[PDB]
Amino acid sequence: ECESGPCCRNCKFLKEGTICKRARGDDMDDYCNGKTCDCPRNPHKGPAT
C-alpha cells in the first residue's frame, strides 16, 4: 500500500515518532508511527509530546 499522507515519504512510513502537524497545548503534535500515515493522533492532554 501507498498511504499517501506525507507524514509518510510519498507512500512509506516516517521514523516512528515523526510529526505530521505541529500541534501544542492539548494535542502534543501528530507523529507517523512506522505503521500509519493518517496524520496519526497523539492525545497526551497534560504532559509534553
Beta pairing partners, 9: none
First to last CA, the chain: 28
Fold of 1-49: Echistatin (4.10.70)
d(CA 29, CA 47): 12
Q: What is the DSSP string of the chain?
A: -----TTBSSSSB-SSSEESS---SSS---EE-SS--S------SSS--
Return all residues near 32 (Cβ < 8 A) that are at least 6 apart: 5, 7, 8, 13, 14, 16, 18, 20, 39, 40
Which of 44, 45, 35 has the alpha carbon at shortest distance from 13?
35
Torsion angle of alpha carbons 7, 9, 11, 12, nearest 10°? -90
Give CA angle at 23 (38, 2), nearest 5°: 20
